[PDB]
Amino acid sequence: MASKRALVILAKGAEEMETVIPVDVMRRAGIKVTVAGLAGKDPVQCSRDVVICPDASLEDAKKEGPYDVVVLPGGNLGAQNLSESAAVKEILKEQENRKGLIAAICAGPTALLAHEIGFGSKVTTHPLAKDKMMNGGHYTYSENRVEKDGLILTSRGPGTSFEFALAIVEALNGKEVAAQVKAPLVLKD
Amino acid sequence: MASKRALVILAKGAEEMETVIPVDVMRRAGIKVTVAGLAGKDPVQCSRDVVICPDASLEDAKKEGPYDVVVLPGGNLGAQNLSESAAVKEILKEQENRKGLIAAICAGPTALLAHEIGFGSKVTTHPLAKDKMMNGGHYTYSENRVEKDGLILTSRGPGTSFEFALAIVEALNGKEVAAQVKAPLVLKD
């Protein structure tokens, strides 16, 4: 069994907590994570001005698939950049076609709407992103902190990022690995 | 009233979640945060291989004090780098002498021990850093998720980082600002 692989797509204006918590937690789980810059190889200015250097450009990372999960951070402007990207559309449609997991948090799930991914699923988002996500009634809305309907895994905000990340770990590597990764984090529950 | 100012000292091997969560939450609170690279101006490879570009070198940022809080992220190797640094020693002793807040998380508080800061305080750390912190009995240990004894504010792990950050916000900008910053995060409590 080869290690699982995750693609985290990092755009200008991404929520840096929603980027770093899943990357770090997935690496703790032994997942090979590629932080891929939407715009290219250069550093990315996140929503609260943390600057992250991606591992690769998305252009290069997309040639090295497939991935066991594609992860979409939130941040209002980051999600808008993901939603406008033809490269993201192609990656998500390929992942959906191959029955691979797609995980999105906060405003991130609105890129699923933009790219017509996973219609008919139960989803959650940040409260403030609900109306955008629900435009057209293509999904059924959930208030769960993490929502998983098959291969569409969504979550609500910075404060649900650990739960989101651990749900990705459980989906890829199982409940026992998720529990082992969780304990050293000092989560409240 | 001018905005409060925070210095976050970023060393190789820092825990990236414990760096980014406080930076982001403090910026949401309107605090002017400087992410200062211990080693210089160049990007920093964190414990789980997230690469963060600092705002400034510590050498330059230290000339632009004083700061209302100095923040020490954890990560075992990052804290060891902070503990070995004469520049960090000088900054922490100046902050202590001026009765300014010092905040440290996970293994971060062990740099307080190394630099002889805040002896006689109640402190917490990550469970695995307790023995190092308690060598000599210079502090009294706490299992609270966040511990504040006057101007020494400590916390336990990645999963206490939001609580830690919000405690810094409350100390600097008050309980109402902390509550307002907290609500959009979708924390469980």
Coordinates of C-alpha atoms in Angstrom, one line a residue:
Chain A
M1 CA 0.0 0.0 0.0
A2 CA 1.5 3.3 -1.2
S3 CA 0.8 6.4 0.8
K4 CA -2.2 8.4 0.0
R5 CA -1.8 11.7 -1.8
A6 CA -3.6 15.1 -1.3
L7 CA -3.7 18.1 -3.6
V8 CA -4.4 21.4 -1.7
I9 CA -5.2 24.2 -4.1
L10 CA -3.9 27.6 -2.8
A11 CA -5.2 30.8 -4.3
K12 CA -4.7 34.5 -3.4
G13 CA -7.0 35.4 -0.6
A14 CA -7.3 31.9 0.8
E15 CA -8.0 31.6 4.5
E16 CA -4.5 30.6 5.8
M17 CA -5.8 28.7 8.9
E18 CA -8.0 26.6 6.6
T19 CA -4.9 25.9 4.4
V20 CA -2.3 25.2 7.1
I21 CA -4.4 23.1 9.5
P22 CA -5.4 20.5 6.8
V23 CA -1.9 20.4 5.3
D24 CA -0.3 19.9 8.7
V25 CA -2.8 17.3 10.0
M26 CA -2.7 15.4 6.8
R27 CA 1.1 15.2 6.9
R28 CA 0.8 14.0 10.5
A29 CA -1.3 11.2 9.1
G30 CA 1.5 10.2 6.6
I31 CA -0.4 11.6 3.6
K32 CA 1.8 13.1 0.8
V33 CA 0.4 16.6 0.5
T34 CA 1.1 18.9 -2.4
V35 CA 0.4 22.6 -1.7
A36 CA -0.2 23.8 -5.3
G37 CA -0.4 27.5 -6.2
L38 CA -3.3 28.4 -8.4
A39 CA -1.4 31.3 -10.0
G40 CA 2.0 29.6 -10.4
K41 CA 5.0 28.8 -8.3
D42 CA 5.3 32.1 -6.4
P43 CA 4.3 32.9 -2.8
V44 CA 0.6 33.4 -2.1
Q45 CA -0.8 36.3 0.0
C46 CA -3.5 34.8 2.1
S47 CA -6.6 36.6 3.5
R48 CA -4.9 37.7 6.7
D49 CA -1.6 38.5 4.9
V50 CA 0.3 35.3 5.9
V51 CA 2.5 34.5 2.9
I52 CA 2.8 30.8 2.0
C53 CA 5.3 29.4 -0.5
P54 CA 3.6 26.6 -2.5
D55 CA 5.3 23.3 -3.1
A56 CA 4.5 23.5 -6.8
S57 CA 2.4 25.4 -9.3
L58 CA -1.0 23.9 -10.0
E59 CA 0.0 23.7 -13.6
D60 CA 2.8 21.3 -12.6
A61 CA 1.0 19.5 -9.8
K62 CA -2.0 18.7 -12.0
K63 CA 0.3 16.7 -14.3
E64 CA 1.2 14.5 -11.3
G65 CA -2.2 13.1 -10.4
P66 CA -4.4 11.5 -9.6
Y67 CA -4.8 12.4 -6.0
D68 CA -6.8 10.6 -3.3
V69 CA -8.3 13.9 -2.1
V70 CA -8.5 17.4 -3.6
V71 CA -8.8 20.0 -0.9
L72 CA -10.3 23.5 -1.4
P73 CA -9.6 26.0 1.5
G74 CA -12.0 28.8 2.1
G75 CA -11.6 32.6 2.4
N76 CA -14.1 34.6 0.4
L77 CA -11.6 35.9 -2.2
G78 CA -9.7 32.6 -2.4
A79 CA -12.9 30.7 -3.1
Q80 CA -13.8 33.3 -5.8
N81 CA -10.4 32.6 -7.4
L82 CA -11.0 28.9 -7.3
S83 CA -14.5 29.3 -8.7
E84 CA -13.2 31.3 -11.7
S85 CA -10.4 28.9 -12.7
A86 CA -10.8 26.6 -15.7
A87 CA -7.9 24.5 -14.3
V88 CA -9.8 23.9 -11.0
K89 CA -12.9 22.9 -13.0
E90 CA -11.0 20.3 -14.9
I91 CA -9.3 18.8 -11.8
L92 CA -12.6 18.6 -9.9
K93 CA -14.5 17.0 -12.8
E94 CA -11.7 14.5 -13.2
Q95 CA -11.7 13.7 -9.5
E96 CA -15.5 13.4 -9.5
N97 CA -15.4 11.1 -12.5
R98 CA -12.9 8.8 -10.9
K99 CA -14.9 8.6 -7.7
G100 CA -12.3 10.4 -5.7
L101 CA -12.8 12.5 -2.5
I102 CA -13.3 16.2 -2.7
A103 CA -13.1 18.3 0.5
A104 CA -13.9 21.9 0.8
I105 CA -14.3 24.3 3.8
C106 CA -16.0 27.6 4.6
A107 CA -16.5 29.5 1.3
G108 CA -14.6 26.7 -0.5
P109 CA -17.7 24.7 -1.3
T110 CA -19.0 27.5 -3.5
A111 CA -16.3 26.5 -6.0
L112 CA -18.2 23.1 -6.2
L113 CA -21.3 25.1 -7.3
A114 CA -19.3 27.1 -9.8
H115 CA -17.9 24.0 -11.4
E116 CA -21.2 22.0 -11.1
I117 CA -19.7 19.4 -8.9
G118 CA -21.6 17.0 -6.6
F119 CA -25.1 18.3 -7.2
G120 CA -27.7 16.6 -5.0
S121 CA -25.3 16.2 -2.1
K122 CA -25.8 17.4 1.5
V123 CA -23.3 20.1 2.1
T124 CA -22.3 22.7 4.7
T125 CA -20.5 26.0 4.4
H126 CA -19.7 29.0 6.5
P127 CA -23.0 30.6 7.5
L128 CA -22.3 33.6 5.5
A129 CA -21.7 31.5 2.3
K130 CA -25.0 29.6 2.6
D131 CA -26.9 31.8 0.2
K132 CA -24.3 31.7 -2.5
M133 CA -24.0 27.9 -2.2
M134 CA -27.7 27.4 -2.3
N135 CA -28.4 29.5 -5.3
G136 CA -30.6 27.3 -7.6
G137 CA -31.2 24.6 -4.9
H138 CA -28.6 22.3 -6.3
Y139 CA -27.5 21.0 -2.8
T140 CA -29.3 20.3 0.5
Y141 CA -27.9 22.4 3.3
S142 CA -26.6 21.1 6.6
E143 CA -25.6 22.9 9.8
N144 CA -23.3 20.0 10.9
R145 CA -19.7 21.2 11.6
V146 CA -18.5 18.6 9.1
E147 CA -20.8 17.1 6.5
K148 CA -19.9 14.1 4.4
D149 CA -22.2 12.8 1.7
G150 CA -20.3 10.1 -0.1
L151 CA -17.2 11.7 -1.8
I152 CA -18.2 15.3 -1.1
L153 CA -16.8 16.4 2.3
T154 CA -17.6 19.9 3.5
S155 CA -17.1 22.0 6.7
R156 CA -17.9 25.4 8.1
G157 CA -15.0 27.7 9.2
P158 CA -11.6 28.2 10.8
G159 CA -12.9 26.7 14.0
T160 CA -14.0 23.5 12.2
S161 CA -10.7 23.0 10.4
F162 CA -9.3 20.4 12.8
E163 CA -12.6 18.4 12.5
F164 CA -12.5 18.8 8.8
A165 CA -8.9 17.6 8.5
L166 CA -9.4 14.6 10.8
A167 CA -12.5 13.6 8.7
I168 CA -10.2 13.6 5.6
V169 CA -7.7 11.5 7.5
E170 CA -10.4 9.1 8.6
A171 CA -11.8 8.8 5.0
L172 CA -8.3 8.0 3.6
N173 CA -6.4 6.2 6.3
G174 CA -9.2 5.0 8.7
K175 CA -10.6 5.8 12.1
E176 CA -7.6 4.4 14.1
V177 CA -5.1 6.6 12.3
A178 CA -7.3 9.6 12.8
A179 CA -7.6 8.9 16.5
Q180 CA -3.8 8.5 16.8
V181 CA -3.2 11.8 15.0
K182 CA -5.8 13.6 17.0
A183 CA -4.5 12.8 20.5
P184 CA -1.2 14.8 20.5
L185 CA -3.1 17.9 19.2
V186 CA -4.8 18.7 22.5
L187 CA -8.2 19.2 21.0
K188 CA -11.1 19.7 23.4
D189 CA -13.1 17.0 21.8
Chain B
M1 CA -5.6 55.0 21.1
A2 CA -3.1 53.5 18.6
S3 CA -3.5 50.0 17.5
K4 CA -1.8 47.3 19.6
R5 CA 1.3 45.6 18.2
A6 CA 2.4 42.0 18.3
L7 CA 5.8 40.4 17.5
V8 CA 5.6 36.7 16.5
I9 CA 9.0 35.1 16.4
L10 CA 9.2 32.5 13.6
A11 CA 12.1 29.9 13.7
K12 CA 12.8 26.9 11.6
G13 CA 10.8 23.9 12.9
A14 CA 8.0 26.1 14.3
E15 CA 4.6 24.5 14.5
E16 CA 2.9 26.2 11.6
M17 CA -0.6 25.9 13.0
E18 CA 0.6 27.6 16.2
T19 CA 2.1 30.4 14.1
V20 CA -0.7 31.0 11.7
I21 CA -3.7 30.7 14.0
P22 CA -2.4 33.5 16.4
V23 CA -1.3 35.7 13.5
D24 CA -4.6 35.5 11.7
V25 CA -6.8 35.8 14.9
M26 CA -4.8 38.8 16.1
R27 CA -5.1 40.5 12.7
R28 CA -8.9 39.9 12.9
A29 CA -8.8 41.8 16.2
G30 CA -7.1 44.8 14.5
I31 CA -3.7 44.1 16.1
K32 CA -0.7 45.1 13.9
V33 CA 1.3 41.8 13.8
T34 CA 4.9 41.4 12.6
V35 CA 5.9 37.9 11.7
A36 CA 9.7 38.1 12.3
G37 CA 12.1 35.5 11.0
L38 CA 14.6 34.4 13.7
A39 CA 17.2 33.6 11.0
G40 CA 16.7 36.6 8.7
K41 CA 14.3 37.7 6.0
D42 CA 14.1 34.4 4.1
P43 CA 11.3 31.9 4.1
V44 CA 10.9 29.6 7.1
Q45 CA 10.4 25.8 6.8
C46 CA 8.0 24.8 9.6
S47 CA 7.7 21.5 11.4
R48 CA 5.2 20.0 8.9
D49 CA 7.0 21.6 5.9
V50 CA 4.7 24.6 5.3
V51 CA 6.9 27.4 4.2
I52 CA 6.1 30.9 5.5
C53 CA 7.6 34.1 4.3
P54 CA 8.2 36.4 7.3
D55 CA 7.2 40.1 7.2
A56 CA 10.7 41.1 8.4
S57 CA 13.9 39.7 10.0
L58 CA 13.9 39.6 13.7
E59 CA 17.1 41.8 13.5
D60 CA 15.0 44.5 11.8
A61 CA 11.8 44.0 13.7
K62 CA 13.5 44.2 17.1
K63 CA 14.5 47.8 16.2
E64 CA 10.9 48.7 15.8
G65 CA 9.6 47.9 19.3
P66 CA 8.3 47.9 21.9
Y67 CA 5.4 45.5 21.3
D68 CA 2.3 45.0 23.4
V69 CA 2.8 41.2 23.1
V70 CA 5.7 38.9 22.1
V71 CA 4.4 35.6 20.9
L72 CA 6.4 32.3 20.9
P73 CA 4.9 29.5 18.7
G74 CA 5.8 25.9 19.6
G75 CA 7.1 23.0 17.6
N76 CA 9.9 21.1 19.4
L77 CA 12.7 22.2 17.0
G78 CA 11.3 25.8 16.7
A79 CA 11.3 26.2 20.5
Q80 CA 14.8 24.8 20.7
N81 CA 15.9 27.5 18.2
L82 CA 14.1 30.2 20.2
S83 CA 15.8 28.9 23.4
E84 CA 19.3 29.1 21.9
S85 CA 18.9 32.7 20.5
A86 CA 20.6 35.6 22.3
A87 CA 18.4 38.0 20.4
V88 CA 15.3 36.2 21.8
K89 CA 16.7 36.4 25.3
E90 CA 17.2 40.2 24.9
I91 CA 13.7 40.8 23.6
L92 CA 12.0 38.7 26.3
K93 CA 14.0 40.3 29.1
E94 CA 13.1 43.8 27.7
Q95 CA 9.4 42.8 27.5
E96 CA 9.4 41.4 31.0
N97 CA 11.2 44.6 32.3
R98 CA 8.6 46.8 30.8
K99 CA 5.7 44.7 32.1
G100 CA 4.6 43.7 28.7
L101 CA 2.7 40.5 27.8
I102 CA 4.6 37.4 26.7
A103 CA 2.6 34.5 25.2
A104 CA 3.9 31.0 24.4
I105 CA 2.3 27.8 23.3
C106 CA 3.1 24.0 23.3
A107 CA 6.9 23.7 23.5
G108 CA 7.2 27.5 23.2
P109 CA 7.2 28.1 27.0
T110 CA 10.5 26.2 27.3
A111 CA 12.2 29.2 25.8
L112 CA 11.0 31.1 28.8
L113 CA 12.9 28.6 31.0
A114 CA 16.0 28.9 28.8
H115 CA 16.0 32.7 29.1
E116 CA 15.0 32.8 32.8
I117 CA 11.7 34.6 32.1
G118 CA 8.7 34.7 34.5
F119 CA 10.0 32.3 37.2
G120 CA 7.4 31.7 39.9
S121 CA 4.5 31.8 37.4
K122 CA 1.9 29.2 36.8
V123 CA 2.4 27.8 33.3
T124 CA 1.1 25.1 31.0
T125 CA 2.8 23.4 28.0
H126 CA 2.2 20.5 25.8
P127 CA 2.1 17.4 27.9
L128 CA 5.3 16.1 26.3
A129 CA 7.1 19.4 27.1
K130 CA 6.2 19.4 30.8
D131 CA 9.4 17.7 32.1
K132 CA 11.7 20.1 30.2
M133 CA 9.7 23.2 31.4
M134 CA 9.7 21.9 35.0
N135 CA 13.4 21.2 35.2
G136 CA 14.5 23.0 38.4
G137 CA 11.0 23.7 39.7
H138 CA 11.1 27.3 38.5
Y139 CA 7.4 27.3 37.5
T140 CA 4.2 25.8 38.9
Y141 CA 2.5 23.5 36.3
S142 CA -1.0 23.8 35.2
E143 CA -3.2 21.5 33.0
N144 CA -5.5 24.3 31.9
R145 CA -5.8 24.7 28.2
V146 CA -4.8 28.3 28.5
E147 CA -3.0 29.6 31.6
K148 CA -2.5 33.2 32.4
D149 CA -0.5 34.3 35.5
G150 CA -0.2 38.1 35.1
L151 CA 1.9 38.9 32.0
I152 CA 2.9 35.2 31.3
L153 CA 0.3 33.6 29.0
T154 CA 0.8 29.9 28.1
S155 CA -1.1 27.2 26.3
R156 CA -0.8 23.5 25.3
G157 CA -1.0 22.5 21.7
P158 CA -2.3 23.0 18.1
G159 CA -5.8 22.3 19.4
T160 CA -5.6 25.1 22.0
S161 CA -4.3 27.7 19.5
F162 CA -7.7 29.4 19.0
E163 CA -8.2 29.7 22.8
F164 CA -4.6 31.0 23.1
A165 CA -5.1 33.6 20.4
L166 CA -8.4 34.8 21.7
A167 CA -6.8 35.1 25.2
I168 CA -4.2 37.4 23.7
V169 CA -6.9 39.4 22.1
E170 CA -8.8 39.7 25.3
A171 CA -5.7 40.8 27.2
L172 CA -4.9 43.5 24.6
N173 CA -8.3 44.7 23.3
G174 CA -10.8 43.4 25.9
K175 CA -13.4 40.7 26.2
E176 CA -15.9 42.3 23.8
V177 CA -13.5 42.5 20.9
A178 CA -12.5 38.9 21.6
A179 CA -16.1 37.8 21.6
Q180 CA -16.7 39.6 18.3
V181 CA -13.7 38.1 16.7
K182 CA -14.6 34.6 18.0
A183 CA -18.2 34.4 16.6
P184 CA -17.3 34.2 12.8
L185 CA -14.8 31.5 13.4
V186 CA -17.4 28.7 14.1
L187 CA -15.6 27.5 17.2
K188 CA -17.4 24.7 19.1
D189 CA -17.0 26.7 22.4

